[PDB]
Symmetry: C2
């Protein structure tokens, strides 16, 4: 590159269609200063290990210029090509017999360089569907060359596979790699004992056009199959470590093919490998996920049995339109309120839908609108199982399902059916002598606790591959929150028994914000403002105590601690575009929110167990950080604390009024609140606490009879 | 078994001693088809009762499918200790049963995991299913291929049998919504005449699944089931027939004698017809005077099935 620009440009299309420089002896086909200069230039371009340089040092001009020409040609081809077989053509130069017999490391070095360039090129291509297909095809191709008959070919293939899986972690839980690798493992296992003296060592991999050659002696075949039998377990455990649900569903789906069932009475090593790898990589379930010092397999068996049974049942009926029958059965089951018929109809409907050629939007719409008429946990579990089966079964259906689920979620938010329900007041014990005796009335939100987990799992799965589901998640998260911190308008319940899902959703929103996906710098500002506004809402009510049992409380504390850490990790500001104004505007509120959350966490953990109870314990780092923050903020002087009251009043009068309830060992807060409420008494109309900040102008002094208009406050306790 | 978890101290000890003696003098009770279900049920009951709001009254519980009751202590520690103590005899008896006769106990375990009631609660703990699917693993043995070698593990048969059984049970149940034995017999005859393996297996499994869910013997169906493989003598049909016979024996009760009689009759007919090992002997030319076009060549009989 460097003379009209057309001259350099024209070489690219020439190299695009140029044939390979293939080839009879090689040498038969083919001024120390210039030789030394070209050697220096080529060694600077390559930068190989010193052994390759030593091998190069004894080469004349012909081999050096051949190497330079082929390097330039392949670099230009890979940079300016458009065919789907860009980088796999380099293995053609490895299979040449003439090159092998020559007195080679330069070829693998330039292959490493071109592979690095190609890998760097694709790192920022796009996030569409086709790039995933190309990466999947390349990964599948690399596996079949891991068992080549030569020696260095498999080593370089292993290195390339390791690099590719390193730079693209999302290929582990793909739905095509596992099937292909299990198939090739089964092919090798079958070829283990096939009458070595009989000819034709070739084999054909099913569902993929390729071929595999095997050595002659039994020992080499046994060694290669044993060597290959380890990467399978390694990749399986790596995939199971991060995202267990998707890979477990894929493994369940793989074991439901009719072809393998007939031969299952024989070895059929793939099924044995799967059913052996399922065991010793499982984890704890919901009940035993958070305890301080069991294993679960019932879900796998139950899901597999239900899936196979209902698939067979739905296939049996098709021998003798039919969607009307399913819809009528589902409607009758819902009207009669029967759980068994509900589950049977749901599974039959999804099994019928999974085996078809059209979307049939009415069936999907009725599937999504199903659980909302039978709000509970059993129907929610059945719906989650059906949704997982539907997602794992068919391909190219994610977007309409996500849209329908988002619509159903929005309708649930609107109807005030769950966490978004209205608030109910109760009589105060001071004047409850009537027949209306006090009693707790806590809202119950069981089903909403699992839907958020499903959303988190789906977001974690779809963070890398897709680029449109992120917009759906953002739209869903934006329409549930509102910036109306005040009396009785927040679109969220404020009871203590409903703090789990609220902070879980807040943590999900913060994780989405930290994902660095939204390009523009304007959506993030609004989202963060709404997050802070809805976070400040919970502290606008008098404190109370939890009403649930000993269980269903530890995980709430864990969620609160995790959210506190995630909030603490926002020193990511300073580039939201006068940036200093917004910077300080956010820093002050962050500090105040951290202090309030620390106080609330301390109070809750104090209420958990009265005694010290050394047997019970929680996360240590979070407790240490909370203690350090409390020690830091407990040393504030009389200043830089009265200013906080002004900020709280600027936020909302109710929050400022409810500030002394969270006890602070300083009398300046009371004086400042009294002064502020005296300056403007009309901003507050909540009697049980705010009345005592205005009535006593002076305790016993009995002076200053002005501005006292108490003829508008609501009645209080006798 | 139900008295092994009594509230007293010496009662459970003497019950354990009596159980040990009884199982010692009658070894055949290990592979019975009712002890395992009852013990799994009581284990599940204890696991459910582990966390049931101790301060709430009524510590009694009712064991399903058996008239009995179980009382539990007050403190959590005693309940955890007793359930942990009971969790060992299960593994001991399971491994003892698996050591001697693996096939029958494996078939019983496969049959146990195919009940509709437990599937709904399977999304929860349901400790019995977990115990079964954990005990299936580390007591398996080598298959036919790797049974005699000098210095691998096999699980495909279990999964294949379970999947085929559930799938074909569901398929046969789906059809009954809309006599019918004639259709099955005609399909089997057509498959045998056309000599197709897939239709052969499908018809065999459908027929045995239909037969296993009925109220009468229907001798013609059993007779056609026994006379099936003899018209398609090979190893694939033999494997399918063995699987179907094992499922039929493990599924229904009080049917062993007619099945044994029919199998004996089929075996006698096979012996008479000279279809296998009992075939005639074929001679071959001697190389000393085999200059004719009838060159010598081995002619060994083949008896795989």
């Amino acid at each position: 590159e460097g003379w009209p620009e057309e001259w350099y440009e024209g070489v690219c299309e020439i190299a695009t269609k140029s044939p390979l420089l293939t080839f009879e002896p090689l040498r038969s086909v083919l001024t120390p200063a210039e030789l030394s200069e070209l050697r220096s230039t080529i060694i600077n371009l390559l930068d190989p290990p010193p052994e390759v340089s030593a091998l190069i040092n004894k080469l004349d001009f012909a081999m050096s210029t051949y190497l330079l020409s082929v390097y330039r040609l392949e670099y230009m081809r890979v940079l300016r090509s458009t065919d789907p077989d860009r980088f796999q053509v380099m293995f053609c130069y490895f299979e040449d017999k003439a090159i092998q017999k020559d007195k080679m490391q330069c070829v693998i070095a330039v292959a490493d360089k071109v592979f690095d360039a190609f890998l760097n090129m694709m790192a920022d291509k796009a996030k569409t569907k086709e790039n995933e297909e190309e990466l999947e095809r390349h990964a599948q191709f690399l596996l079949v060359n891991f068992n080549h008959i030569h020696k260095r070919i498999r080593r370089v293939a292993d290195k390339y596979l390791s690099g590719l899986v390193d730079k693209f972690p999302h290929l582990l839980w793909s739905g095509t790699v596992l099937k292909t690798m299990l198939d090739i493992l089964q092919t090798l296992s079958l070829s283990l004992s096939a009458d070595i003296h009989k000819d034709q060592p070739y084999y054909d991999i099913p569902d993929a056009p390729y071929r595999i050659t095997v050595p002659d002696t039994y020992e080499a075949r046994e060694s290669i199959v044993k060597d290959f039998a380890a990467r399978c377990g390694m990749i399986l455990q790596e995939a199971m470590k991060w995202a267990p649900t998707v890979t477990k569903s894929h493994l369940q789906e793989y074991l439901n093919k009719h072809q393998n069932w007939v031969s299952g009475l024989s070895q059929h090593t793939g099924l044995a490998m799967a059913t052996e790898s399922i065991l010793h990589f499982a984890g704890y379930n919901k009940q035993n996920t958070t305890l301080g010092a069991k294993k679960d397999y019932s879900n796998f068996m139950a899901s597999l049995n239900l899936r196979n049974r209902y698939a067979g049942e739905v296939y049996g009926m098709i021998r003798f339109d039919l969607n009307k029958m399913m819809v009528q059965d589902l409607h009758s089951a819902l009207d009669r309120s029967h759980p068994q018929h509900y589950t049977q109809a749901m599974f039959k409907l999804t099994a019928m839908l999974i085996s078809s050629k059209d979307c049939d939007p009415q069936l999907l719409h009725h599937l999504c609108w199903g659980p909302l008429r039978m709000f509970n946990e059993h129907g929610m579990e059945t719906a989650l199982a059906c949704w997982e089966w539907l997602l794992a079964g068919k391909d190219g259906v994610e977007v309409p399902f996500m849209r329908e689920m988002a619509g159903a979620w929005h309708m649930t938010v609107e109807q005030k059916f769950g966490l978004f329900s209205a608030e109910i007041k109760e009589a105060d014990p001071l004047a409850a002598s009537e027949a209306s005796q006090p009693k707790p009335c806590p809202p119950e939100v069981t089903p909403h606790y699992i839907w958020i987990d499903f959303l988190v799992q789906r977001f974690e799965i779809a963070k890398y591959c897709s680029s449109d589901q992120v917009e759906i998640f953002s739209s869903l998260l934006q329409r549930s929150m509102s910036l109306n911190i005040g009396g009785a308008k927040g679109s969220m319940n404020r009871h203590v028994a409903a703090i789990g899902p609220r902070f879980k959703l807040l943590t999900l929103g913060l994780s989405l914000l930290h994902a660095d996906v939204v390009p523009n710098a304007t959506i993030r500002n609004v989202l963060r403002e709404k997050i802070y506004s809805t976070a400040f809402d919970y502290f606008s009510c008098p404190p109370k105590f939890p009403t649930q049992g000993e269980k269903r409380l530890r995980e709430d504390i864990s969620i609160m601690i995790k959210f506190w850490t995630a909030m603490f990790s926002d020193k990511k500001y300073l580039t939201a575009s006068r940036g200093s104004q917004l910077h300080k505007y956010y820093m002050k509120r962050r500090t105040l929110l951290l202090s309030l959350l620390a106080t609330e966490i301390e109070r809750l953990i104090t209420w958990y167990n009265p005694l010290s109870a050394p047997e019970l314990e929680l996360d240590q780092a979070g407790e240490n950080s909370v203690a350090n923050w409390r020690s830091k903020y407990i040393s504030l002087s009389e200043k830089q604390w009265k200013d906080n009251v002004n900020l709280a009043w600027s936020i909302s009068p109710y929050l400022a009024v409810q500030l002394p309830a969270r006890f602070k060992n300083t009398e300046a807060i009371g004086n400042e609140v009294t002064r502020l409420v005296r300056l403007d008494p009309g901003a507050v109309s909540d009697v049980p606490e705010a009345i005592k900040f205005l009535v006593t102008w002076h305790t016993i002094d009995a002076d200053a009879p002005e501005l006292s208009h108490v003829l508008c406050w609501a009645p209080t306790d006798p």
